Design a protein around this nucleic acid. Sequence first.
RNA 1: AAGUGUAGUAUCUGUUCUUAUCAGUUUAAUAUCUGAU
RNA 2: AUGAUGUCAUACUUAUCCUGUCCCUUUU
Lengths: 122, 932, 48, 75, 48, 55, 79, 111, 100, 108, 95
Amino acid sequence: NPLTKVKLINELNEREVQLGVADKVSWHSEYKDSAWIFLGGLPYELTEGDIICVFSQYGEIVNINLVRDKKTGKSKGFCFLCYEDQRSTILAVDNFNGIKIKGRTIRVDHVSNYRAPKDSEE
Amino acid sequence: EYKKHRRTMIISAETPRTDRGGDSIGETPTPGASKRKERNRPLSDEELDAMFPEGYKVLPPPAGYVPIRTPARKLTATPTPLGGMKSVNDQPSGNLPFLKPDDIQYFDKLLVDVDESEEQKERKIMKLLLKIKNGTPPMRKAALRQITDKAREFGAGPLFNQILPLLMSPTLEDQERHLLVKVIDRILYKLDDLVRPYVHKILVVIEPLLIDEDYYARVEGREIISNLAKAAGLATMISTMRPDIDNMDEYVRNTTARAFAVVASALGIPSLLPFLKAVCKSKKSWQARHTGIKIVQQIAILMGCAILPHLRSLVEIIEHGLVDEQQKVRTISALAIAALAEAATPYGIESFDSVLKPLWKGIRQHRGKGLAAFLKAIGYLIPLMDAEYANYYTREVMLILIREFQSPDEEMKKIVLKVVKQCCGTDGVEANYIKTEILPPFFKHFWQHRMALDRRNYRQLVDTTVELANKVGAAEIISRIVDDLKDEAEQYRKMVMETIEKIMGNLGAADIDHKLEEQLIDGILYAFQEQTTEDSVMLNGFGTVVNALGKRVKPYLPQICGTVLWRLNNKSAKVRQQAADLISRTAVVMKTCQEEKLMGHLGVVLYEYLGEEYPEVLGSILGALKAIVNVIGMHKMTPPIKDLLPRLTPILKNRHEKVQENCIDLVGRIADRGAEYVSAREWMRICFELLELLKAHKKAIRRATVNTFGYIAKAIGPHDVLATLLNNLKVQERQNRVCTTVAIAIVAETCSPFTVLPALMNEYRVPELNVQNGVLKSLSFLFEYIGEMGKDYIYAVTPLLEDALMDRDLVHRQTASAVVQHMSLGVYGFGCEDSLNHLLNYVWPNVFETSPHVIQAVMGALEGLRVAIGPCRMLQYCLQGLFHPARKVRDVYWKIYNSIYIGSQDALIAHYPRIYNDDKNTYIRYELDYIL
Amino acid sequence: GGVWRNTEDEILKAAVMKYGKNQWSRIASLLHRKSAKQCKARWYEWLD
Amino acid sequence: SSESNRDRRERLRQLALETIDINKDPYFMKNHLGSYECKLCLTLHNNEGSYLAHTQGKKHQTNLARRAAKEAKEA
Amino acid sequence: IPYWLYKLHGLNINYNCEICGNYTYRGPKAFQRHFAEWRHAHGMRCLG
Amino acid sequence: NRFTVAELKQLVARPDVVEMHDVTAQDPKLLVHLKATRNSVPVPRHWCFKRKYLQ
Amino acid sequence: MTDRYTIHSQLEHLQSKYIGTGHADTTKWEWLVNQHRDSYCSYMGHFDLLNYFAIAENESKARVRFNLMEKMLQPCGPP
Amino acid sequence: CRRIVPGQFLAVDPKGRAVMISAIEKQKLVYILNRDAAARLTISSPLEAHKANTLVYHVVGVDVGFENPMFACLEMDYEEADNDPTGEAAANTQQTLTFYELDLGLNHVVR
Amino acid sequence: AKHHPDLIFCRKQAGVAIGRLCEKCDGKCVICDSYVRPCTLVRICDECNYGSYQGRCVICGGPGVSDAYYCKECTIQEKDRDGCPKIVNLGSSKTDLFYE
Amino acid sequence: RLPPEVNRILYIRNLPYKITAEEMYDIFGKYGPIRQIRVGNTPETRGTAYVVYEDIFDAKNACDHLSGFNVCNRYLVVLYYNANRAFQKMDTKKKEEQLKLLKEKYGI
Amino acid sequence: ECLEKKVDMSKVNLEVIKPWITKRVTEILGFEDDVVIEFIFNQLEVKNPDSKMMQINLTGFLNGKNAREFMGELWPLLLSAQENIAGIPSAFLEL
RNA sequence: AAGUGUAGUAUCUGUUCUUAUCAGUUUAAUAUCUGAU
RNA sequence: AUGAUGUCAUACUUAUCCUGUCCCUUUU
């Protein structure tokens, strides 16, 4: 359930690759008009700049936002990043989605809905 | 990665509890010291001696090699960068097929060629597992038979000790695992009590077979676990599954849960009820309650409707779980309640009433996936409620559902889809309010090009769309879904087509408007024009759409005909296959709409394209021709039968599957319906060609061949067909060999059996055992197919059956018993008592026999005789055998008596003779002697 | 393969006696177990 | 194949009959179920090979020598 | 020395027939034949 | 324990249908009462044979 | 209670669950009791049979019904 | 007319909601009657009430005002006396009124 | 069955459900295993059809199309009045066929 | 950075009965410290043996290098040790002493 | 055996037998377990329980000798409690 | 000079008990098997 | 002069059987 989200994303990508999905229907028509990618499941001890530098390998990040708690210390695992171009978001969802770093691997998805602070899930 | 824990499985109540306590007190101080500040950890002499088995001795040869290897830690760093006959032994015994290198470690004991040395003798005799796993099919069957017979001899201990590691082979392929599972099942079918100590050892290897992707493999694992549980006691299985509750490995917890579910399915719900109740009331750890909730959920999902009576009791197990502090326990309890609900038909709403109030209360304080679980539970519980409370429940839940409509969580999406399918199906759902509130988001938020890609998501969306269309209306869903008809996505297009087809089939397309009808026609055209994956979605959709449109599809008829022609001229296997499929599907609509010129043009194009070499296209063309002959009349069909029959004659040797099936169907329909355009010599040639069609690897082909032979017999005549059938030399005894006898029976049922009887009696005079057995089987099948018609042929069939009753061969006796069974079933009430007695006179000695086929035939014939000859004569013939001294004779006679007593329970009163009254027993029914 | 069974050996002997030794295909057309090369090999090896 | 199988079976039966005639064996007898039986061996044979193979084992000719000497006391 | 036949056919089975003149029989079928035979017939006749 | 064949024949009403294998039965009296029925059919001769009733 | 007798089932064998199916080790008392019970049930079933059996005695139909239902328990005798 | 063949006893409840069929022994089925949208009396699936070694003397319907209906039967146990060579347990075997309730919610019969 | 003697019939109590047979096993008798002379209809068990178990084939076990019926030889022999003839077991058939 | 199949224990078969064990220890030490070396003292064990080094990396390196290495007249086959599958002969008794020692040493 | 006499767990308390059974299990089973205690408590939940099934469960959990000891300790105490007019054995009054 | 697999049956070829007794299991009874002289 | 034994071949019967799937494992 919690870790099966990355499995579902990888399975969707594999099915699009195996079902002969074209470029126009390659799991991007729904995430269009917005490059706000939501990363979740990250560890509680992750820093903002470290994650920015890690996700910056696929391009320049425009506006990142980590889940800042009221008094916990900004340790929730959720994060929303509107990158420079939507092509960078697609590249991150294709390569960085499900990447393993700092022990527990995290998941990535394309929201393209709004700037919701409380929208992810533990 | 999750399955990799299976690789970490080692083999082999108070001592286990202390071991688990030591495991916990070893798994605590590791992170303790980690915070205070592996598989390659230090090893001990005890650990070393325990790791490897016997047959080894530690021996550091000199006193210098030990202090040569002791500084090897430093010798890996400083001195490492520095200045610096024809023997072999495979494993043959007499054949002993090639053992893989991974299997070399397992079958190493057989590599030694020593012979003639008891325990080692049995261990070497247990090397047949190598031939079973690796070897030819005959060697596999022989090893299976030897293991079945040598169960008690080889002993269950060594068998399990040799089978468990093979199951744990990292290189164990799927076929090897299947063979090992079959061998374990065969071993468990014989050994009953000896499987108790190896319960845990077998379960540790069998549980992962349940948690697997292969559906057939999961079914085999569930069956094996159920058999293992039914073998030993529920108490022993419970003791074996006890420590797995608090196991650290969550995979071990899931395995134990599946095992407990299988044990409950086998030994029954209440047998495992109090163990589960004690597991649920465990305040030891939250993992215990989680394992209990998972076990309850799995047991419900496996049992289905079996939780009806114990459901209230299950509520007693689940009531204290809803108040769990840890969110995991609460989620597991919600999933369990949802499983018990959705698996249960409407009943026992009161049993769930205790869980009604808090869950909705949790909806008030719902946040995160807990809200999703609560929504799923409320959706499962809504139909179980009555309309009065259901109105308020649905009115409250719909707002939360609409609020959660924009959830990115795919689990939340599935929960919302299930809640919509459950709630929208309620009678208290507002149609206009539904179309106003839930319809536009369901089309926008729920319907997306990414959701359809998933497997479960596709079926969930299909069910939700079907329910919404049935609830609110068909026109709105049609208008929402027709726009996606031109979708570039093939999967989304298939989903939209399936939704439209289900809607048209359930609600009916009469509500489809003219503009909506044209849009649907354009969508179907675009879909048929773009079909990459070979699937019946587009074909079934076009068929249902045409059947629903009816006469309204006449304006769309010519466009469809032009598209079909262009696709027939297009790529054959890609385009013309679907073209012929659409033609065969819409033949009914084309004939209903009076497409006379269209039907003739289609027939001409079919006669033109019948010469295609592609079997996929040729078979579809033949099927379309069959459909046209079914819609267009024989004399009205423009491609007349005079050209169709001889042209389809040599097509029987196409050797393709679909081509052969379509050709057989077309020839059979033409010969059953018309039976006139086919000439006598033409019919003889068609029969000579169909005689070769019986060698196929299918059963439907054989049935169609028999039907076509019967039609040809009814058309031409009995003599030539019986002569062509009598030449069956039966090269092979299988591959539809008896099929000639079935065809003889079909011809006898279609034609005069007065002609078919003596020809068969004369053909039975041949010497060949194959021909004699064939004549017997054909006579049996003919009597069975005739039934009431056999009132005259009884006296004529008596002597041949009496002569063949002489057991010269087992197959002859089997055919005799089968013919007797068919005759007794067919001669019911016709007055054939004399022939029945004459046949029983020779059938009675057949009771003593060991052949499974012969024994089954004798039992069936005894049943038929009791049906027709009557139970009085049956008991009179089986009376002396009841109290016989022997074991085998008493067993056979008791089987016969049980068969005679299963039925005729009322008529056994009179047949019971008068046995004299002993001293301490008065068995004589004096009331029967009451002379009025 | 070529197990060189007993019944196969008798059949090969009868074929060499009746059919002949210079007719390996005539004997292989009544064996249906091995090739004419294998048949002549068994004839020159054990059935000579 | 199938017809070829029947032709091969007929040719095998012909070769077996020729061998039995050349050997002048009385034991080989055709059964009423399309089989062969050796009255000397008092055994059955499914195929022609099993009937022609009743000359290596079960040498009942030695047991028939007893009846030969019982019918005539002189050697 | 077909001891297999001796054990399987029922040989080496002692039986005493007082009706058959107090005779011996080395088998069960032999016992049934001795109970009904010319010797036992003459014995029953002389015994009445 | 086991009744004598002569005793079972003397106690039987129709001892002409007595067998040698009936002395070691479980209920010889019941077997004798059953074997002397009117239309009772007996067991076949394959109870002691060894040719499988077809050899 | 050291008995060690757990007679439930072993490998899903035949296991005749019908009442009076019959077996191999069925003693004479068992067959006699089953036959008497089946005959009593049949006499209770056939209406004309009940009339013919009760027409002998002056007892009524209910008298025969009670006498038959009472003879079900231990008709032959304690084995 | 078998001993395990229902037909020796047939009962109909007073509320007209269910019917029961019981044999001389080892058989008891409870069929549920329900009114359809077209007033078609639909016979639902039966409930299994197998009671081994229980001879049923008669059957009757209990009174229930739209509550959980009950059916009464004069049962007698035969398994105990079936293993009494002394003949004592044959006596002291008293028939008992067994009222089995057909729980509409549980959808199963129970003693 | 004659083709599968290692099969275990359900033998459950009869319900009010009508079953169907797979298209591959269309027309085959449920009990008699014949191909002609049907007499009575086939009744499914109550637990034999509940959701995913609904609409399955009686003998074939697959998705059903046509409604099955008992063979007349099985009806006249008092065999059609038996328990639920659902094939609960699946073994010694179609086990290794997936491997091929 | 290696498969789970690699383990510290390695089974070496196809050796003589009187194999020079000092040279065997020297050859095994080319990888790392020989934690244990068990020589089959049984008849079927005569000619087979097991080794266990204190490191998995060195053992894998020697397995790659010593794959069917040459001998005086043969070439012993070296394979990765399979799972135990036989431990009921052994038992986890007396581990409470080690647990108490660990709890007393660090004090946690 | 002493467990062959018919008993009735409805005519006796349960709290009086809880700690005694707990101590017996801790002595026989040695360690501290909640599954065994809860199983033994739920075993005596019915109004007319059976001692044979309880003995079988105890043999499955215990070794078989300790199972016999537990059966022979629980049967007579429960019988004496059911025989007591107040519904408890002689040990409940001692302390 | 072509058949695939799933269960079961028979006829073919090669080998073995002149062991005298006692007791038991088992057998319809033999037989076989298990311990002693 | 029937038989028991069982590697290794052979004929036969079950109207035996080839698109069967992960539609349900989503446990950390």
